[PDB]
């Protein structure tokens, strides 16, 4: 039985980055070249392994994190960079191993559309594969704020105001971070060529 | 009550060095996105360097590799190291807290540095 | 990145008059811009943010209005203490290093 990767990258709703949504792939033959040889996609990045080589190779799991940003902010999601996004949303670490996946979906994802929220003030970064859900407001100085927004009182989310009139690194783009474990545990996820 | 304190201003030759401070208070330096924005004699305002308050650091182009912006907590103290200085660094210098949607609220009174031989 | 323009780059006004500048941006921002008045020799001062919402302690005959690409700020009855250059400012650009408009300055009729 193949890997349900139709049911990540054919989503019809996907999440905002600040909750970014992670299915663990599990039990099941994946076919990468699949994804690999199609046109749909701006941005197909691998770290530590080969595209080409995918179908040839068994992990312990895999991970696809999936998520909207905008298209100035997917440079941000590779190792080692910073950014609102890198620092504040979604992080991936210096040894990563797997495949960053992404393509406007200004068709899709720009009505003005303000559903889409990223998290704009955060004290400190992210750590790897971390993901932070609060609403607290946030306290940017030394008086608490009760929950009530005001002076050094910021609601901690922000929305992207995506529409659909503006330039390309402006627009949404849909995000699938493939993540791929190896660990001394069963190898459950093979490509068609093992 | 809410300040920015901008002090480290004065005159300097071409190609030496100076350091800014920013003493805040009323607001917590680490936890702010922190800026320093300068203007030169008759021009509109440029922004120079940005701290995030994770810790990120960002310069503008035009003081790429020669302007660091530092803060230390204990002093709730916003700092921008300026090397390899240059006439047409000449300006008023001011820190500012940037709140982004809601504005930039707080800015120093501005500090004058001049470059010249 | 984001240019941005205002108009007019002069205007020339009473006391008492009602005064309003625009202000053009090279993207649809949404309403993330703020206003600024200056003096000169001196900072300058919040006036209105994310587009619409008045900074506290700034006098109600200050608001502001718009959304997407092109923003006015109006003055309903003009003061003489307002009587100064007034900058918008895009808040949406990465990595934080925003753009100022040009700068509008209001002097006064004769």
């Known amino acids: 039985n193949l890997c349900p990767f139709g049911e990540v990258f054919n989503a019809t709703r996907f999440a905002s980055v600040y909750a970014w949504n992670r299915k663990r792939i599990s039990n099941c033959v994946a076919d990468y070249s699949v994804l690999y040889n199609s046109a749909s996609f701006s941005t197909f990045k691998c770290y530590g392994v080969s595209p080409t080589k995918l179908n040839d190779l068994c992990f312990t799991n895999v991970y696809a994190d999936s998520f909207v940003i905008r298209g100035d902010e997917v440079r941000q999601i590779a190792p080692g960079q910073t950014g609102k996004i890198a620092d504040y949303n979604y992080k991936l670490p210096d040894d990563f191993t797997g495949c960053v996946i992404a393509w406007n979906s200004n068709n899709l994802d720009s009505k003005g559309n303000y559903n889409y929220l990223y998290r704009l003030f955060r004290k400190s970064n992210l750590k790897p594969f971390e993901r932070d859900i609060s609403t607290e407001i946030y306290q940017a100085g030394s008086t608490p704020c009760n929950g009530v927004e005001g002076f050094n009182c910021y609601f901690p989310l922000q929305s992207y105001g995506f529409q659909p009139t503006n330039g390309v690194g402006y627009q949404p783009y849909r995000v699938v971070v493939l993540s791929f474990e190896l660990l001394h545990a069963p190898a459950t996820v093979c490509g068609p060529g093992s | 009550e809410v300040q920015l304190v901008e002090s480290g201003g004065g005159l300097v030759q071409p190609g030496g060095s100076l350091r800014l401070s920013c003493a805040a208070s009323?607001?917590?330096?680490?936890?702010?996105?922190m800026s320093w924005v300068r203007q030169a004699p008759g021009k509109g305002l440029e922004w120079v360097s940005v701290?995030?308050?994770?810790?990120?650091?960002y310069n503008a182009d035009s003081v790429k590799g020669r302007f660091t912006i530092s803060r230390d907590n204990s002093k709730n103290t916003l700092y921008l190291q300026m090397n390899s200085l240059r006439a047409e660094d000449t300006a008023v210098y001011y820190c500012?807290?940037?709140?982004?949607?809601?504005?930039?609220?707080?800015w120093g009174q501005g500090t004058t540095v001049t470059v010249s031989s | 990145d984001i240019q941005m323009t205002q108009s007019p780059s002069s205007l020339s006004a009473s006391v008492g008059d009602r005064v309003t500048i625009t202000c053009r941006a090279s993207?649809?921002?949404?309403?993330?811009l703020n206003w600024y008045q200056q003096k000169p020799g001196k900072a300058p001062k919040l006036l209105i943010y994310?587009?619409?919402s008045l900074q506290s302690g700034v006098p109600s005959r200050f608001s502001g209005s718009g959304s997407g690409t092109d923003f006015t700020l109006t003055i309903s009855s003009l003061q003489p203490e307002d009587f100064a250059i007034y900058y918008c400012?895009?808040?949406?650009?990465?990595?934080?290093?925003?753009?100022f408009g040009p700068g509008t300055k209001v002097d006064i009729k004769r």
């Open positions: 994310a587009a619409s």
């Open positions: 701290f995030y308050p994770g810790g990120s650091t």
């Open positions: 400012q895009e808040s949406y650009s990465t990595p934080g290093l925003f753009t």
């Open positions: 993207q649809s921002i949404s309403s993330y």
């Open positions: 500012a807290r940037d709140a982004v949607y809601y504005g930039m609220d707080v």
């Open positions: 009323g607001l917590t330096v680490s936890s702010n996105y």
